[PDB]
């Protein structure tokens, strides 16, 4: 398919410097213009810098110019985003897209890379079980769940049974706690009647800390 | 740099309902404009470039009208996937500029929600802290309101909340409430209530558990 991939997003400094890749597939770079949007978290989209084909003409925003630098290896295939100077207003997820026609639209993206511009320091998660039981069950459901408490920086991804269970599921939104650390639950509805049978396990995955758990929820009565 | 205006800035409306969202152009940008879809969790994805034209493989209910300084996204009939953040974005003249965006949710008929309470694990306790987690499953409106108790006593200052976005298939929400306390200030106290209000319920219902079972 046609494809963008960002890496090298993460957790920075203030004042500090990052560079972000974007590994190009499906079809041919050197054809079409480049571009990097950037999101700032429950905020809207930001147009960063746009590059020709060749390396012809780069732009850039106003509030980014002096700092940032876009740049594209074709014989590689992959875009360039060095990011100079990081402030705590760069905090965002950032987007590598592709141009089209002479309409300047975007006419695909990719999935985003989060970058964090924060003196804070890293820290993986703790993973509790949210177990189910009768307070837990009304009318042949029960929910159930995981807690993963006191984190940072985002983000948490979290499955369960590696892939198997994705019905019912609500990982729900991070909330950064007064501790400065994030904290977020994910919850699964299942039947009651599996209980005693199947098995529960919530996978959390923290990369930028390096951490993996996998936590048993059993239930309560 | 031209500002784009985006009106209204949030929405609600049902399925199969006429959607009409408004960008303005603060000078006249021809036919450069773009219209982008923003689903949560996910990437912008073009649906009507040119002003008016659309990206192929996107649904003909979505339909794109204007030129110089006054465009309009128009969804004909809206369907439960439809929930998403609408963007323009003038293409004409560098800076390029974006719409603040316009945040589309499908009414639906009410919902209450399922509420579910779960006291804190013992691995936890350990560590010194407790974390009470009330959930609130599958409602519509996104309006409620959790009440923690502690012994009947009203808690305020000392929990969190957090909504999923609306479920594209149910347009349905899901909330969790979080009660953190001290190991300390959670071994004084015996119940603990969650008494939630919603639309969808006749009164308020509680959910609660004694610290001991």
């Known amino acids: 398919e046609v494809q963008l991939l960002e890496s090298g997003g993460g957790l920075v400094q203030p004042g500090g410097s990052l560079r972000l890749s974007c590994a190009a597939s499906g079809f041919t770079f050197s054809s079409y213009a480049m571009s990097w949007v950037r999101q700032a978290p429950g905020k809207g989209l930001e147009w960063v810098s746009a590059?020709?084909?060749?390396?012809?003409?780069?732009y850039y925003a106003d509030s980014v110019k002096g700092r940032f630098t876009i740049s594209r290896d074709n014989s590689k295939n992959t875009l360039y985003l060095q990011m100079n100077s990081l402030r705590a207003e760069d905090t965002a997820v950032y987007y590598c897209?592709?141009?089209?026609?002479?309409?300047?639209?975007?006419?695909?993206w990719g999935q985003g890379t989060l970058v964090t511009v924060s003196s804070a320091s890293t820290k993986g998660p703790s993973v509790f079980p949210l177990a189910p039981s009768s307070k837990s069950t009304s009318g042949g459901t029960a929910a159930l769940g995981c807690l993963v408490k006191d984190y940072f920086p985002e983000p948490v991804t979290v499955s369960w049974n590696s892939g198997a269970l994705t019905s019912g599921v609500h990982t729900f939104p991070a909330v950064l706690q007064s501790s400065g650390l994030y904290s977020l639950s994910s919850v699964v509805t299942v039947p009651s009647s599996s209980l005693g049978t199947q098995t529960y396990i919530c996978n959390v995955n923290h990369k930028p800390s390096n951490t993996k758990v996998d936590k048993k929820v059993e239930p309560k009565s | 740099d031209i500002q784009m205006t985006q009106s209204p800035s949030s929405l609600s409306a049902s399925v199969g309902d006429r959607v009409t969202i408004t960008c303005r152009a603060s000078?006249?940008?021809?036919?450069?404009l773009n219209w982008y879809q923003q689903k949560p969790g996910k990437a912008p994805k073009l649906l009507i470039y040119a002003a008016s034209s659309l990206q192929s493989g996107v649904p003909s209910r979505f339909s794109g009208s204007g030129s110089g300084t006054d465009f309009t996204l128009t969804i004909s009939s809206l369907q439960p996937e439809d929930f998403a953040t609408y963007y323009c974005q003038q293409s004409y003249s560098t800076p390029l500029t974006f719409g603040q965006g316009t945040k589309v949710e499908i009414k639906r008929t009410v919902a209450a929600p399922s509420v579910f309470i779960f006291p804190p694990s013992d691995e936890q306790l350990k560590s010194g802290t407790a974390s009470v987690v009330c959930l609130l499953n599958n409602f519509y409106p996104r309006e409620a309101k959790v009440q923690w108790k502690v012994d009947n006593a009203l808690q305020s200052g000392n929990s969190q909340e957090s909504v999923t976005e609306q479920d594209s298939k149910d347009s349905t929400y899901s909330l969790s409430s979080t009660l953190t306390l001290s190991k300390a200030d959670y071994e004084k106290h015996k119940v603990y209530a969650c008494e939630v209000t919603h639309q969808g319920l006749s009164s308020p219902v509680t959910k609660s558990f004694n610290r001991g079972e």
């Open positions: 897209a592709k141009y089209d026609g002479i309409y300047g639209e975007l006419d695909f």
């Open positions: 000078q006249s940008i021809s036919s450069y």
């Open positions: 590059i020709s084909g060749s390396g012809g003409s780069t």
